[PDB]
Write an enzyme that holds these catalytic residues in place. Structure first.
Site, PDB file in Angstrom:
ATOM      1  N   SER A   9      -8.743  11.034  27.669  1.00  0.00           N
ATOM      2  CA  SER A   9      -9.222  12.266  27.060  1.00  0.00           C
ATOM      3  C   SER A   9      -8.911  12.358  25.576  1.00  0.00           C
TER       4      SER A   9
ATOM      5  N   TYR B  71       0.827  -1.201   0.000  1.00  0.00           N
ATOM      6  CA  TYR B  71       0.000   0.000   0.000  1.00  0.00           C
ATOM      7  C   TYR B  71       0.863   1.254   0.000  1.00  0.00           C
TER       8      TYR B  71
ATOM      9  N   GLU C 242     -14.237  12.505   4.808  1.00  0.00           N
ATOM     10  CA  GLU C 242     -13.064  11.909   4.188  1.00  0.00           C
ATOM     11  C   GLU C 242     -11.773  12.613   4.575  1.00  0.00           C
TER      12      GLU C 242
ATOM     13  N   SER D 253       0.455  10.115  18.332  1.00  0.00           N
ATOM     14  CA  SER D 253       0.193   9.804  19.730  1.00  0.00           C
ATOM     15  C   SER D 253       1.157   8.766  20.278  1.00  0.00           C
TER      16      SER D 253
ATOM     17  N   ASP E 200       2.838  17.112 -10.934  1.00  0.00           N
ATOM     18  CA  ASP E 200       1.706  17.972 -11.260  1.00  0.00           C
ATOM     19  C   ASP E 200       1.803  19.297 -10.520  1.00  0.00           C
TER      20      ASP E 200
ATOM     21  N   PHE F 294      -5.724  23.514   3.449  1.00  0.00           N
ATOM     22  CA  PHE F 294      -5.744  22.072   3.279  1.00  0.00           C
ATOM     23  C   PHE F 294      -4.462  21.560   2.655  1.00  0.00           C
TER      24      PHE F 294
ATOM     25  N   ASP G 157      -3.742 -11.749  12.040  1.00  0.00           N
ATOM     26  CA  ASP G 157      -4.090 -11.221  10.725  1.00  0.00           C
ATOM     27  C   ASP G 157      -5.384 -10.435  10.886  1.00  0.00           C
TER      28      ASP G 157
ATOM     29  N   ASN H 124      -8.737  -8.272   2.156  1.00  0.00           N
ATOM     30  CA  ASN H 124      -7.680  -7.278   2.265  1.00  0.00           C
ATOM     31  C   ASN H 124      -6.819  -7.225   1.011  1.00  0.00           C
TER      32      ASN H 124
HETATM   33  C1  HEO Z   1      -6.509  16.762   6.381  1.00  0.00           C
HETATM   34  C2  HEO Z   1      -7.587  17.375   5.886  1.00  0.00           C
HETATM   35  C3  HEO Z   1      -8.157  18.527   6.423  1.00  0.00           C
HETATM   36  C4  HEO Z   1      -8.259  18.890   7.717  1.00  0.00           C
HETATM   37  C5  HEO Z   1      -7.775  18.138   8.938  1.00  0.00           C
HETATM   38  C6  HEO Z   1      -8.925  20.167   7.742  1.00  0.00           C
HETATM   39  C7  HEO Z   1      -9.203  20.867   8.878  1.00  0.00           C
HETATM   40  C8  HEO Z   1     -10.139  21.851   8.958  1.00  0.00           C
HETATM   41  N1  HEO Z   1     -10.656  22.502   7.865  1.00  0.00           N
HETATM   42 FE1  HEO Z   1     -10.162  22.281   5.983  1.00  0.00          FE
HETATM   43  N2  HEO Z   1      -9.252  20.596   6.485  1.00  0.00           N
HETATM   44  C9  HEO Z   1      -8.774  19.588   5.673  1.00  0.00           C
HETATM   45  C10 HEO Z   1      -8.874  19.584   4.322  1.00  0.00           C
HETATM   46  C11 HEO Z   1      -9.635  20.456   3.632  1.00  0.00           C
HETATM   47  N3  HEO Z   1     -10.230  21.578   4.158  1.00  0.00           N
HETATM   48  C12 HEO Z   1     -10.865  22.117   3.080  1.00  0.00           C
HETATM   49  C13 HEO Z   1     -11.598  23.251   3.120  1.00  0.00           C
HETATM   50  C14 HEO Z   1     -12.096  23.781   4.273  1.00  0.00           C
HETATM   51  C15 HEO Z   1     -13.180  24.709   4.342  1.00  0.00           C
HETATM   52  C16 HEO Z   1     -13.956  25.284   3.179  1.00  0.00           C
HETATM   53  C17 HEO Z   1     -13.819  26.806   3.160  1.00  0.00           C
HETATM   54  C18 HEO Z   1     -14.500  27.415   1.962  1.00  0.00           C
HETATM   55  O1  HEO Z   1     -15.740  27.407   1.955  1.00  0.00           O
HETATM   56  O2  HEO Z   1     -13.865  27.391   0.901  1.00  0.00           O
HETATM   57  C19 HEO Z   1     -13.371  24.995   5.633  1.00  0.00           C
HETATM   58  C20 HEO Z   1     -14.389  25.923   6.236  1.00  0.00           C
HETATM   59  C21 HEO Z   1     -12.411  24.238   6.358  1.00  0.00           C
HETATM   60  C22 HEO Z   1     -12.302  24.268   7.699  1.00  0.00           C
HETATM   61  C23 HEO Z   1     -11.549  23.394   8.406  1.00  0.00           C
HETATM   62  C24 HEO Z   1     -11.615  23.290   9.830  1.00  0.00           C
HETATM   63  C25 HEO Z   1     -12.516  24.118  10.741  1.00  0.00           C
HETATM   64  C26 HEO Z   1     -10.742  22.331  10.160  1.00  0.00           C
HETATM   65  C27 HEO Z   1     -10.457  21.868  11.553  1.00  0.00           C
HETATM   66  O3  HEO Z   1     -10.210  20.464  11.599  1.00  0.00           O
HETATM   67  C28 HEO Z   1      -9.169  22.481  12.065  1.00  0.00           C
HETATM   68  C29 HEO Z   1      -9.108  22.387  13.576  1.00  0.00           C
HETATM   69  C30 HEO Z   1      -7.705  22.462  14.071  1.00  0.00           C
HETATM   70  C31 HEO Z   1      -7.325  23.364  15.020  1.00  0.00           C
HETATM   71  C32 HEO Z   1      -8.202  24.520  15.375  1.00  0.00           C
HETATM   72  C33 HEO Z   1      -6.265  23.022  15.996  1.00  0.00           C
HETATM   73  C34 HEO Z   1      -5.261  24.153  16.101  1.00  0.00           C
HETATM   74  C35 HEO Z   1      -5.690  25.053  17.211  1.00  0.00           C
HETATM   75  C36 HEO Z   1      -5.497  24.741  18.524  1.00  0.00           C
HETATM   76  C37 HEO Z   1      -4.145  24.754  19.140  1.00  0.00           C
HETATM   77  C38 HEO Z   1      -6.626  24.271  19.376  1.00  0.00           C
HETATM   78  C39 HEO Z   1      -7.094  25.369  20.307  1.00  0.00           C
HETATM   79  C40 HEO Z   1      -8.565  25.597  20.132  1.00  0.00           C
HETATM   80  C41 HEO Z   1      -9.008  26.463  19.192  1.00  0.00           C
HETATM   81  C42 HEO Z   1      -8.025  27.267  18.419  1.00  0.00           C
HETATM   82  C43 HEO Z   1     -10.365  26.299  18.593  1.00  0.00           C
HETATM   83  N4  HEO Z   1     -11.631  23.480   5.527  1.00  0.00           N
HETATM   84  C44 HEO Z   1     -10.679  21.347   1.900  1.00  0.00           C
HETATM   85  C45 HEO Z   1     -11.283  21.699   0.566  1.00  0.00           C
HETATM   86  C46 HEO Z   1     -10.938  20.868  -0.615  1.00  0.00           C
HETATM   87  C47 HEO Z   1     -10.976  21.740  -1.835  1.00  0.00           C
HETATM   88  O4  HEO Z   1     -12.054  22.279  -2.118  1.00  0.00           O
HETATM   89  O5  HEO Z   1      -9.898  22.235  -2.202  1.00  0.00           O
HETATM   90  C48 HEO Z   1      -9.915  20.310   2.240  1.00  0.00           C
HETATM   91  C49 HEO Z   1      -9.412  19.171   1.381  1.00  0.00           C
HETATM   92  C1  LIG Z   2       1.531  16.110 -18.381  1.00  0.00           C
HETATM   93  O1  LIG Z   2       2.603  16.488 -17.529  1.00  0.00           O
HETATM   94  C2  LIG Z   2       2.994  15.646 -16.537  1.00  0.00           C
HETATM   95  C3  LIG Z   2       4.409  15.219 -16.448  1.00  0.00           C
HETATM   96  O2  LIG Z   2       5.319  15.666 -17.368  1.00  0.00           O
HETATM   97  C4  LIG Z   2       6.707  15.846 -17.078  1.00  0.00           C
HETATM   98  C5  LIG Z   2       4.820  14.298 -15.374  1.00  0.00           C
HETATM   99  O3  LIG Z   2       6.001  13.925 -15.280  1.00  0.00           O
HETATM  100  C6  LIG Z   2       3.830  13.819 -14.393  1.00  0.00           C
HETATM  101  C7  LIG Z   2       4.264  12.872 -13.309  1.00  0.00           C
HETATM  102  C8  LIG Z   2       4.738  11.621 -13.996  1.00  0.00           C
HETATM  103  C9  LIG Z   2       5.989  11.203 -13.812  1.00  0.00           C
HETATM  104  C10 LIG Z   2       6.470   9.970 -14.504  1.00  0.00           C
HETATM  105  C11 LIG Z   2       6.914  11.970 -12.908  1.00  0.00           C
HETATM  106  C12 LIG Z   2       7.340  11.063 -11.762  1.00  0.00           C
HETATM  107  C13 LIG Z   2       8.843  11.038 -11.653  1.00  0.00           C
HETATM  108  C14 LIG Z   2       9.481  12.038 -11.041  1.00  0.00           C
HETATM  109  C15 LIG Z   2      10.974  12.012 -10.939  1.00  0.00           C
HETATM  110  C16 LIG Z   2       8.676  13.175 -10.460  1.00  0.00           C
HETATM  111  C17 LIG Z   2       9.505  14.439 -10.330  1.00  0.00           C
HETATM  112  C18 LIG Z   2      10.181  14.427  -8.985  1.00  0.00           C
HETATM  113  C19 LIG Z   2      10.704  15.535  -8.458  1.00  0.00           C
HETATM  114  C20 LIG Z   2      10.613  16.831  -9.203  1.00  0.00           C
HETATM  115  C21 LIG Z   2      11.389  15.452  -7.122  1.00  0.00           C
HETATM  116  C22 LIG Z   2      12.647  14.602  -7.263  1.00  0.00           C
HETATM  117  C23 LIG Z   2      12.273  13.144  -7.180  1.00  0.00           C
HETATM  118  C24 LIG Z   2      13.102  12.173  -7.586  1.00  0.00           C
HETATM  119  C25 LIG Z   2      12.712  10.731  -7.509  1.00  0.00           C
HETATM  120  C26 LIG Z   2      14.455  12.486  -8.141  1.00  0.00           C
HETATM  121  C27 LIG Z   2      14.927  11.220  -8.839  1.00  0.00           C
HETATM  122  C28 LIG Z   2      16.316  10.858  -8.387  1.00  0.00           C
HETATM  123  C29 LIG Z   2      17.373  11.518  -8.861  1.00  0.00           C
HETATM  124  C30 LIG Z   2      18.745  11.146  -8.400  1.00  0.00           C
HETATM  125  C31 LIG Z   2      17.194  12.642  -9.850  1.00  0.00           C
HETATM  126  C32 LIG Z   2      18.555  13.263 -10.099  1.00  0.00           C
HETATM  127  C33 LIG Z   2      18.444  14.742 -10.375  1.00  0.00           C
HETATM  128  C34 LIG Z   2      19.461  15.582 -10.123  1.00  0.00           C
HETATM  129  C35 LIG Z   2      19.288  17.039 -10.419  1.00  0.00           C
HETATM  130  C36 LIG Z   2      20.773  15.102  -9.544  1.00  0.00           C
HETATM  131  C37 LIG Z   2      21.457  14.126 -10.492  1.00  0.00           C
HETATM  132  C38 LIG Z   2      22.843  14.585 -10.859  1.00  0.00           C
HETATM  133  C39 LIG Z   2      23.827  13.682 -10.939  1.00  0.00           C
HETATM  134  C40 LIG Z   2      23.546  12.234 -10.656  1.00  0.00           C
HETATM  135  C41 LIG Z   2      25.218  14.121 -11.309  1.00  0.00           C
HETATM  136  C42 LIG Z   2      25.822  13.109 -12.275  1.00  0.00           C
HETATM  137  C43 LIG Z   2      25.089  13.176 -13.593  1.00  0.00           C
HETATM  138  C44 LIG Z   2      24.835  12.056 -14.278  1.00  0.00           C
HETATM  139  C45 LIG Z   2      24.103  12.128 -15.582  1.00  0.00           C
HETATM  140  C46 LIG Z   2      25.280  10.731 -13.738  1.00  0.00           C
HETATM  141  C47 LIG Z   2       2.428  14.254 -14.490  1.00  0.00           C
HETATM  142  C48 LIG Z   2       1.413  13.777 -13.508  1.00  0.00           C
HETATM  143  C49 LIG Z   2       2.003  15.165 -15.555  1.00  0.00           C
HETATM  144  O4  LIG Z   2       0.811  15.511 -15.597  1.00  0.00           O
END
Ligand code: HEO
Ligand SMILES: COC1=C(OC)C(=O)C(C/C=C(/C)CC/C=C(/C)CC/C=C(\C)CC/C=C(/C)CC/C=C(/C)CC/C=C(/C)CC/C=C(\C)CCC=C(C)C)=C(C)C1=O
Ligand SMILES: CCCCCCCCCCCCCCCCCC(=O)OC[C@H](COP(=O)(O)OCCN)OC(=O)CCCCCCCCCCCCCCCCC
Ligand SMILES: CCCCCCCCCCCCCCCCCC(=O)OC[C@H](COP(=O)(O)OCCN)OC(=O)CCCCCCCCCCCCCCCCC
Ligand code: HEM
Ligand SMILES: [Cu+2]
Lengths: 184, 99, 262, 658
Positions: free
Chosen positions: D315, D61, D286, D299, D75, D420, D135, D142
């Protein structure tokens, strides 16, 4: 061994409850999406919906007798009460496809309104669940007759007892929210 | 765990007095629509209840208790995703008319 | 978390100015439980790391109450005042809620076409694309809709945003406390050419300058007086420049919605 | 073949997508070459692919997530460059037709395929070990779940090769995803990859629920489980309950795209707001499926490297349970701007702040696990001290979005984007990297390299605050999500700083690859023998370095909370029993890849409208399933001699280094 799968299947049935719940919300909103088309009272032949229900309420008691026979170790009676259950579920599926055919070949198909779409996907999904249950019960009678009432086929009868009785529990919410509450 | 022949034939002789009474009231017409809708819903919950009690035999002693617990939790997720969605999409539809 | 001369932290509208004072209230109602939580994560990782043989090492200390109840009541005592504030502001910054002012609102009907905005003035009769105009210190009534996929009418410097769906009238109320030329955008992705839905909200200094803008708007050979002329301004196009139409069909904004409703 | 499939569907004249699909076809074949050369094809069929073993499935996984963290990051680094070119004069290199497939295939991938099977990859490797089980409750379910996750990868990694992907956002919206505004097969790749991977991830949420409930050791009550198991129990109640909302919200879209139904169109009855409601009714729950198992990874890392019992166990459990139920009444905060009233906006805006109190109590419990302790600065604890600082800011800026008065101006904008990413990159990703380096000695046997794991943290947390704090000052300047052309040059100086931060993240991903390579190479020196390299507390450290196919020879008898650190404290640790008994292990089943291989055919045929092939694939999915039930050999008894041999090897390794 067994009993852990029955509980996992009950949890899957809860996920299925929620799945069907999502379809009962989409129908609750789009029930009035009947743009220029047929409303609820116009297409629901209520007697035809009653005869379906009695073909599914018998489909739960006939399975209950199969479960009782399995608890009595009476394989022949298990097959006899499972073959009769597959005969009422088959009738329910036949009447379901007959209704969905009477609707489609008259223009009132799933692409006529937002209502008929929300109606073909809620009742149609229950029909898909019932026909999957029929495929399961037919591929289960082949194993009851072949092997017998082994420790692995007693779980499948109880894992199907949950699934098959649950399909008749959803239907209690289908004819009362779609057909009764619509043709009222 | 096990269901006798008396558990059935008492949830079957009772589920017919619950699949006919609504299917007769809402069919021939017997009362105001405010009482018909209440009857076909109160009897629609009692029948589901008798099914859960006597068809999918559901006590509190199954699976160390996590058999009624999972269901009661799943109902709380349906009553939140249905009542929530209906409430929202009633507030959304009204706020987008030709006011 | 920055910007002193930005849009949302320096608005020029009342709907925008009352949301800035709301963001700065939340930002500060949460620095009571975030500044310690970030300071404690650094001060505890340092004072008790591995080699500080000058503190107390108690690996038998889980259950306390003076540190468990005061830590599960400051988030509560914060969210509570952050909740009544949320309620009051939501029932005061609602888009539908009309603005309070002693001046009639200038109703503008916003149809979000395919990668271009279309603003109809039902009272004056003009209908311009990718440009609005309204007097400063005067409420406006945006009746936003769409002719295509769901967009989002947004004027960042003036206030809130509101979605725009095909057969649906969503309402927005803004007001420009100061003149200028405030940028507008679409705040929801709308397809290949969404990066060109950029209008300019010219807020005139007075009303006399707005009447002379309607004048130059009602001086164009174009004419949006039929539905077959609206469907001509629906061919998918991108980066539509400003374009002033002329005498408009009455109830035109009502005819756009009354085609996804029949 | 038949259907809409034709050479006018593979991008030939596009230069960028021609090098990629010629590199993956070159890398995916060099892989086959390397495997066939070393002859490791039989070993990769009887041991890894056809495997009902949570340890070998929790490593496959993660390998998927790691190998597509690169696919999802490329991307990012390309749409971070286009916004840096389109903000200053130049048009760029990604036309709005090829960019809209980038931010779509970057959210779909890095949520369902880089974040989801990285959280599930840890709940699979460690959860059966902590509770003391041999398991998961359903072994065959799984392997099938994993191969149903891959069956959604062979459809996204092929979407850029033949055809195109969606151009709608990672949560493709009804009016834009309908067959009238996106008629090409780009949403069908989005539909059948999330559908054939949602069916697979729902079945893996039923596994870890029944496993944690009815497979625990003889004595582990529900209030003596590890906190990772508790969080992985509360994160599966969110999989069983929310993912059914996805298998319908997607299925309602297929009928709207195949049978011409009017569910989500804008004419003839369809409400295009019911999809935006349902997809977020699942969307929110999700995001707590991802952050709860990471609240467990952190934790146990804090309670282990600080040499102190986790502060307030009872808690933290009544906070995960709250978050499990409080995450179903908050899903409207994602469309505050849609146009709901002031009584539903304000209600769903309050309940989404009440959900911040349990998260705050969780964050503050870890601060007191470190209060009076000995905080070893192993790289796994470096993430935890960094996760708190990178998640408090995210939560703070996310509760500020929960206010529907401040969510109207801070809706889709480069302020939403960086929250996010603040709570995911600072949250899930740190936890997916802190749990990868913490349980690496328990999955392979050797310990990850440390002088490269440290350098992998100081580029991921430094390269974040310099790549998304610029995306915090832009939301206040009035930018929008998914902008790629003619960006107003006022956003320039903030988009170049935000681009010079993804370079540091890229350097922080290169450091991960270098760390893995060096640790795999120099394994014979950074080797873990006693099975307890860090001084853990939970039961997964009582086994050997790689725990045998059976987890425990004799199921451990738990008496207290820290089940292993209590045995190790009183002395009853590493004790040899008298008589072992033959174990009852499941049999490696190869009918899970076939049900999945017969599902890519079904998906690839329903996408390209090849009906004679969709029928065959669907039948093959319900023929390999019918004949799997007639297979009356699914378990075998591991004899006592092999158990004796393995346990004597392990006890020798222990007693020779004591
Ligand atoms: C890992 C995923 C993740 C998590 C954990 C969160 C966490 C939270 N998110 Fe975010 N979000 C996530 C992922 C997203 N959120 C999104 C969008 C989104 C929107 C939409 C806003 C708008 O309409 O565009 C809201 C309102 C929130 C709110 C929150 C809130 C209230 C939390 C809360 O869980 C946060 C709570 C955490 C806090 C507060 C702890 C820190 C503070 C302390 C120390 C505690 C003390 C007590 C207080 C401060 C209250 N999120 C989207 C939109 C996707 C997309 O459209 O792009 C995604 C994917
Ligand atoms: C349509 O456009 C899109 C692409 O176009 C490019 C995509 O690639 C992709 C993703 C598809 C892929 C196949 C890309 C996945 C592969 C990679 C590498 C993602 C890019 C990763 C990064 C930018 C972070 C680096 C991650 C790595 C694994 C690096 C790989 C390991 C190495 C060592 C790279 C080396 C690079 C260097 C600058 C150092 C190397 C230099 C030396 C070795 C010196 C000696 C020189 C020689 C020649 C021996 C998408 C989704 C896409 O939409
Ligand atoms: C439309 C797509 C639907 C996808 C599949 C549904 C169509 C056909 C349904 C499956 C085929 C019929 C039944 C399966 C054939 C044989 C199954 C069986 O052998 O039953 C025994 C088994 C008991 O468990 P066990 O024996 O230990 O399993 C080991 C190997 N299976 O029993 C089991 O525990 C497992 C069997 C569970 C049955 C699941 C049926 C679910 C029905 C879903 C219908 C889909 C509705 C569409 C929803 C989308 C919303 C619009
Ligand atoms: C809407 C989607 C449309 C897409 C097209 C349809 C997709 C279907 C194609 C794939 C076929 C379905 C999956 C096939 C396997 C089903 C799971 C199964 O086999 O159950 C096995 C499990 C017992 O197995 P175990 O104890 O682990 O040991 C192995 C001994 N044989 O038995 C159990 O313990 C029961 C626990 C789970 C019970 C069945 C699991 C789900 C039922 C079938 C899923 C059908 C999907 C439809 C909707 C998805 C939502 C789940
Ligand atoms: C590795 C560093 C990352 C970078 C540089 C990055 C960059 C970006 C960019 C530039 C966008 C689009 C901005 C815009 O829409 O204007 C984006 C969107 C997104 N990212 Fe990331 N991202 C990263 C990591 C992640 C991670 C770890 C996840 C989740 C595990 C994630 C999930 C998303 C999602 C869901 C979207 C929304 C895409 C859409 O709008 O359709 N990203 N990312
Ligand atoms: Cu959310």
């Amino acid at each position: 061994a067994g009993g852990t799968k029955i509980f996992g299947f009950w949890i899957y049935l809860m996920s299925d409850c929620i799945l069907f719940s999502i379809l009962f919300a989409t129908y609750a909103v789009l029930v009035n999406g009947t743009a220029g088309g047929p409303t609820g009272k116009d297409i629901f032949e209520l007697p035809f919906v009653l005869v379906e229900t009695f073909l599914l309420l018998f489909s739960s008691i006939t399975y209950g007798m199969a479960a009782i026979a399995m608890y009595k170790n009476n394989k022949s009676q298990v097959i006899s009460w499972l073959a009769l259950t597959w005969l009422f579920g088959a009738g329910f599926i036949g009447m379901e496809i007959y209704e969905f055919h009477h609707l489609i070949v008259n223009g009132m198909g799933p692409d006529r309104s937002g209502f008929l779409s929300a109606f073909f996907a809620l009742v149609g999904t229950h029909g898909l669940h019932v026909t999957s249950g029929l495929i399961w019960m037919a591929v289960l009678m082949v194993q009851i007759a072949r092997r017998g009432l082994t420790s692995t086929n007693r779980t499948r009868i109880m894992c199907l007892s949950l699934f098959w009785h649950f399909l008749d529990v959803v239907w209690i919410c289908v004819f009362t929210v779609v057909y009764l509450m619509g043709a009222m | 765990s096990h269901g006798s022949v008396k558990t059935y034939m008492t949830g079957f002789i009772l589920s017919i007095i619950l699949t006919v009474i609504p299917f007769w009231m809402v069919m021939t017409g017997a009362a105001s629509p405010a009482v018909i809708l209440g009857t076909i819903l109160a009897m629609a919950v009692v029948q589901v209840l008798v099914h859960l009690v006597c068809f999918l035999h559901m006590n509190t002693k199954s699976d160390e208790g996590w058999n009624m617990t999972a269901f009661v939790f799943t109902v709380l997720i349906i009553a939140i995703l249905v009542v929530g969605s209906i409430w929202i999409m009633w507030n959304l539809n009204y706020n987008m008319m030709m006011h | 978390l920055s910007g002193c001369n930005s849009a949302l932290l320096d608005p020029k509208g009342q709907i925008g100015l009352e949301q800035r004072s709301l963001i700065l209230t939340a930002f500060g109602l949460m620095l009571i439980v975030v500044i310690p939580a970030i300071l404690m994560a650094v001060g505890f990782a340092w004072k008790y790391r591995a080699s500080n043989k000058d503190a107390k090492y108690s690996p038998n200390w889980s259950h306390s109450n003076k540190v468990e109840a005061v830590v599960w009541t400051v988030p509560i005592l914060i969210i509570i005042f952050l909740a009544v504030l949320t309620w009051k502001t939501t029932h005061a910054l609602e888009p539908s809620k009309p603005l309070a002012h002693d001046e009639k609102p200038i109703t503008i009907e916003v149809v979000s076409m395919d990668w271009k905005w279309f603003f109809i003035y039902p009272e004056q009769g003009i209908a311009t694309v990718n440009e609005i105009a309204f007097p400063a210190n005067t409420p406006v009534y945006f009746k936003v809709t769409s002719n295509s996929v769901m967009n989002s009418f947004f004027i960042p410097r003036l206030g809130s945003q509101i979605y725009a769906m095909a057969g649906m009238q969503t309402r927005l109320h803004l007001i420009a406390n100061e003149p200028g030329t405030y940028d507008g955008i679409s705040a929801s992705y709308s397809g290949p050419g969404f990066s060109g839905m950029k209008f300019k909200a010219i807020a005139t200094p007075d009303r006399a300058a707005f009447d002379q803008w309607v004048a130059k708007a009602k001086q164009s050979p174009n004419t949006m007086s039929d539905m077959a002329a609206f469907e001509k301004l629906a061919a998918p196009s991108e980066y539509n420049q400003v374009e002033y139409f002329s005498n408009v069909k009455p109830d035109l904004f009502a005819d756009v919605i009354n085609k996804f409703m029949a | 073949m038949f259907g809409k499939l034709s050479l006018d569907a593979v991008p030939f004249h596009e230069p960028i997508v021609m090098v990629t699909i010629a590199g993956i076809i070159l890398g995916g074949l060099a892989l086959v070459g390397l495997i066939t050369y070393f002859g490791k094809w039989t070993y990769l069929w009887k041991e890894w692919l056809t495997s009902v073993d949570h340890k070998r499935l929790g490593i496959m996984y993660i390998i998927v997530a790691i190998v597509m963290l690169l696919r999802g990051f490329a991307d990012a680094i390309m749409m971070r460059s286009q916004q840096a070119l389109a903000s200053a004069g130049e048009a760029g290199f990604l036309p709005p037709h090829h960019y809209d497939q980038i931010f779509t295939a970057h959210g779909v991938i890095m949520i369902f395929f880089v974040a989801m099977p990285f959280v599930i990859g840890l709940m699979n490797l460690v959860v059966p070990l902590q509770i003391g089980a041999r398991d998961v409750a359903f072994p065959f379910l799984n392997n099938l779940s994993f191969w149903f996750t891959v069956v959604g990868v062979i459809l996204v990694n092929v979407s850029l090769g033949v055809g195109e992907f969606a151009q709608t956002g990672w949560l493709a919206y009804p009016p834009l995803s309908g067959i009238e505004y996106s008629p090409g097969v780009g949403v069908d790749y989005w539909i059948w990859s999330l559908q054939l991977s949602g069916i697979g991830t729902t079945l893996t949420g039923i596994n870890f629920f029944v496993t944690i409930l009815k497979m625990r050791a003889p004595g582990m009550t529900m209030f003596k489980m590890p906190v990772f198991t508790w969080a992985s129990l509360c994160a599966n109640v969110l999989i069983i309950a929310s993912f059914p909302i996805l298998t319908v919200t997607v299925a309602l879209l297929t009928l709207d795209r195949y049978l011409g139904t009017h569910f989500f169109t804008n004419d003839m009855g369809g409400n295009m707001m019911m999809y935006i409601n349902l997809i977020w009714a699942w969307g929110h729950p999700e995001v707590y499926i991802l952050i709860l198992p990471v609240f467990g990874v952190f934790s146990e890392i804090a309670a282990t490297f600080s040499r102190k019992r986790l502060f307030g166990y009872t808690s933290l459990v009544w906070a995960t349970v709250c978050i499990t139920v409080l995450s179903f009444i908050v899903w409207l905060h994602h469309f505050f701007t849609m146009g709901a009233g002031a009584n539903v906006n304000a209600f769903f805006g309050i309940t989404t702040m009440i959900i911040a109190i349990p998260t705050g109590v969780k964050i503050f419990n870890w601060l007191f696990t470190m209060y009076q302790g000995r905080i070893v600065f192993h790289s796994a604890m470096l993430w935890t001290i960094g996760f708190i600082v990178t998640f408090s800011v995210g939560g703070m800026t996310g509760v500020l979005l929960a206010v529907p008065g401040a969510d109207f101006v801070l809706h889709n904008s480069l302020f939403l984007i960086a929250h996010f990413h603040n709570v995911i990159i600072g949250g899930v990703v740190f936890g997916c990297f802190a749990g990868m380096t913490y349980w690496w000695p328990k999955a392979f046997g050797f310990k990850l390299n440390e002088t490269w794991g440290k350098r992998a943290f100081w580029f991921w947390i430094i390269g974040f605050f310099v790549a998304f704090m610029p995306l915090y000052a832009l939301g206040f300047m009035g930018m929008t999500r998914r902008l790629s052309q003619q960006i107003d040059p006022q956003f320039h100086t903030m988009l170049m700083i935000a681009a010079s931060g993804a370079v540091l993240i890229a350097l922080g991903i290169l450091c991960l690859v270098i760390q893995m390579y060096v640790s795999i190479r120099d394994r014979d020196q950074n080797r873990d023998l006693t099975g307890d390299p860090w001084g853990g507390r939970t039961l997964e450290w009582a086994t050997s370095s790689p725990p045998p196919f059976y987890n425990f020879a004799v199921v451990p008898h738990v008496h207290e909370r820290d089940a292993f650190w209590e045995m190790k404290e009183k002395g009853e640790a590493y004790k040899k029993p008298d008589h072992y008994e033959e174990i009852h292990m499941p049999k490696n089943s190869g009918a899970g890849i076939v049900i999945a291989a017969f599902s890519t055919i079904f998906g690839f045929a329903m996408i390209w409208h090849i009906w004679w092939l969709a029928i065959v694939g669907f039948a093959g999915m319900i023929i390999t399933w019918i004949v799997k039930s007639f297979d009356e050999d699914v378990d075998y008894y591991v004899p006592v001699a092999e158990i004796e041999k393995l346990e004597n090897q392990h006890f020798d390794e222990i007693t020779k280094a004591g």
